[PDB]
Design a protein around this ligand. Structure first.
Ligand SMILES: Nc1nc2c(ccn2[C@@H]2O[C@H](CO)[C@@H](O)[C@H]2O)c(=O)[nH]1
Ligand SMILES: Nc1nc2c(ccn2[C@@H]2O[C@H](CO)[C@@H](O)[C@H]2O)c(=O)[nH]1
Ligand SMILES: [Zn+2]
Ligand SMILES: [Zn+2]
Lengths: 157, 157
């Protein structure tokens, strides 16, 4: 299950950067093997710096399920969520997070050095008990390659 | 001028609580001395856990100014911005944050212990260069009083 939805998030990243909606980031929210939302970064399309892939997916999934908590759902992110997105995941009560590429893969092509302490367990005040899985193997390699692959199709923001 | 805009953010908090839009939190974004956005928590109204007051104000200000960066604006928050909102403030490039009440005042009436390390200066992977001002005196008194005045006037989230 993890490989399928992670690859869906990666394909979302490619599609979003290809049509100019935003950067090469995707996110898929799933409810017991049923996809609730499949989104990508929409910062450029929406003129909204908060419209990262994870935030957009949370908004769509909550609107669909008519509830402000997604405690029965899991989220798959093509790239390690930023501090804003990890905070949104925390507030959404999503029960599990799977992400493909480390934030350094995005930093390597010029993105901001902007990493969530609560995700990496380096905070004094912010903690997380959320189940976090960093993908390994084939899906992880594919997810990491997204940034070297799409460096040319968009411009940093 | 700081007291006027902080008090407007507090007024937004009270308004949002009174009409059931969300919790007792407000945010106002100003360009010099002109209000660009005046918002409160819309989590309940929008069925959107990301629709905190600060995120809402950032979205509305970015729409008003037709751009994804607010480097010439400042933000006033009735309460210390959470990790998600502080991440959004970082991404929006707002040049100054003034906040009224410490997060402990909100936690003391039922909200989660959910504090941004980067705001308090304890972040390792997230570092802010933003100018941050915690309100004192009358502004702090007003902002802290928000939570005693609105206790059990709203649904917790
Ligand atoms: N996962 C994820 N990351 C995203 C975005 C958008 C930008 N970024 C940047 O990526 C770097 C480290 O994550 C930071 O500079 C972030 O601002 C997204 O939509 N999803
Ligand atoms: N500033 C601000 N805070 C908000 C909200 C909504 C909830 N909260 C909670 O308040 C506590 C302290 O920040 C945290 O648990 C947050 O989740 C908001 O709209 N604006
Ligand atoms: Zn993000
Ligand atoms: Zn917040």
């Amino acid at each position: 299950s993890d490989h399928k939805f992670l690859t869906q998030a990666v394909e979302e990243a490619y599609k979003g950067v290809d049509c100019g909606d935003g950067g090469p980031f995707g996110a898929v929210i799933v409810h017991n093997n049923e996809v609730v939302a499949s989104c990508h970064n929409m910062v450029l399309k929406y003129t909204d710096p908060t419209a990262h892939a994870e935030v957009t997916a949370i908004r769509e999934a909550c609107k669909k399920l008519n509830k402000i908590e997604l405690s029965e759902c899991e989220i798959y992110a093509s790239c390690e969520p930023c501090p804003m997105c990890f905070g949104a995941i925390h507030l959404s009560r999503l029960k599990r997070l799977v992400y493909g590429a480390k934030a350094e893969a995005a930093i390597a092509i010029g993105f901001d050095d902007f990493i969530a302490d609560a995700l990496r367990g380096t905070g004094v005040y912010q903690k997380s008990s959320l189940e976090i899985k960093k993908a390994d193997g084939n899906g992880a390699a594919i997810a990491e390659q997204v940034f070297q692959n799409t460096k040319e199709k968009f411009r940093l923001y």
